[PDB]
Amino acid sequence: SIINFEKLGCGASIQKTPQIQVYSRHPPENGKPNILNCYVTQFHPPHIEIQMLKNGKKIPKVEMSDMSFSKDWSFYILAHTEFTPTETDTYACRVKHASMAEPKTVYWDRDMGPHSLRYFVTAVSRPGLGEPRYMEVGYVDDTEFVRFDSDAENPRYEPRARWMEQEGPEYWERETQAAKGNEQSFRVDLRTLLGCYNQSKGGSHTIQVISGCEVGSDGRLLRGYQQYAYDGCDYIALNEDLKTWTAADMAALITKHKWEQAGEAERLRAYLEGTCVEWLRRYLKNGNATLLRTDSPKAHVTHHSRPEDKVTLRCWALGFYPADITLTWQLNGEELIQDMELVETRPAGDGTFQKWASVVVPLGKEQYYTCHVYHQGLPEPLTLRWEP
């Protein structure tokens, strides 16, 4: 259950470039249907335009995931489309974002315990295009389980996991009206923050919030979160003492003083230690079947030619959950962290994740190198080599 937010009350009346990965969900074999992913991360503002292309031509039926954002406030989204790869068909993803003067085209390179209840909130103004888009997304241990999206004719809180359907109508009614009340507070905050930052009246701006609690196995609050951002930058955040605020700039110093006078830190501490903890216990009970599940990675090495007497060994880790994982290459028992190439961990699109790490080695010396896969789902780290 999300908290009822208090207005920032700042006063009376920088963009990040996207990172792109294009990859198939499964190993691409010609003639076999597959899924082509376009993973776009680390961008701000949230507005973005993603097209997937086949031999230069736009692919019509491209499905897009809901947009989320990370702890560093940057947004990410997954686009994907059905495709049957052939030997000569070229695929690419093209991204248009305000941080770039031209659209970026990336071509598909077919190269062979404690718990937490957190709410991620986004409010994005759209001057001349309608009302601000407001979103509340709840997570139990990185697993999205509820969502409120204002972009509907009758917006309501919706279960995003099957185990949330047990909650009765009184729950969804109360959460829905709480979200609509929260939406109004952020609409007002978007209005006043314009003047507090001396900004024009016709541009799109964003407020982001991360609110919730991390609770240990003993039921005690490990960490409480109440962190705000405006236009992707730190605005104000509750400190770990749950008593004082860290205001990131001058405009937030007005909010800090007002919240001190109103005793907002005490209201948040009561929610975090009480309501948040009690609801997390309820959500953990109802989702006990699938929330604790982990899928260990399946791993293998691929072999790629290089100019002259070098080859590339690429160590794959596939189908694992959660996303936290470590891949290392070793020569003679020492880790070659200094000369590996990695890709950021990426979703397969079916709930599991992918990652690979590569190293350039001399031709004929492939059997001298070992890849190591560390994941919490493994009873022991994986160790493997290139098998011809």
Residue numbers in the entry: 1 to 13, 24 to 122, 143 to 418
Sentences from the paper on this structure:
MHC Is are heterotrimers consisting of a transmembrane heavy chain (HC), β2-microglobulin (β2m), and a peptide antigen, typically of 8–11 amino acids in length. Major histocompatibility complex class I (MHC I)3 molecules present a diverse array of antigenic peptides, the so-called immunopeptidome, to circulating cytotoxic T lymphocytes. Here, endoplasmic reticulum aminopeptidase 1 (ERAP1) and ERAP2 trim peptides to the optimal length for stable MHC I binding in the final editing step of the antigen processing pathway. The construct consists of SL8 peptide linked with β2m and Kb HC in which the C terminus of SL8 is tethered to the Kb-binding groove through a disulfide bond between Y84C of Kb and a second cysteine within the peptide-β2m linker.
Based on an examination of the native structure of the SIINFEKL (SL8)/Kb pMHC I complex, and the structure of the single-chain SL8-β2m-Kb HC trimer, we introduced alanine substitutions at residues 63, 66, and 167 in the MHC I HC which interact with the bound peptide in the A-pocket. Positions Glu63 and Lys66 interact directly with S(P1) and I(P2) of SL8, whereas Trp167 caps off the N terminus amino group of the peptide. Similarly, the hydrogen bond between the backbone carbonyl group of I(P2) and the side chain amine of Lys66, present in WT-, E63A-, and Trp167-SCT, is not present in K66A-SCT. The space created by the shorter Ala66 side chain is occupied by two water molecules, one of which is stabilized by a hydrogen bond with the carbonyl group of I(P2). Interestingly, the side chain of N(P4) adopted similar orientation in K66A-SCT, whereas two alternative rotamer states of the N(P4) side chain were resolved in W167A-SCT. Expression of WT (*002) ERAP1 (25) in SCT transfected HeLa E1KO resulted in a significant decrease in the levels of all A-pocket variants detected by 25-D1.16 (∼35–40%). All three SCT variants displayed lower free energy barriers of dissociation with respect to the WT-SCT and in the order of 3–8 kcal/mol.
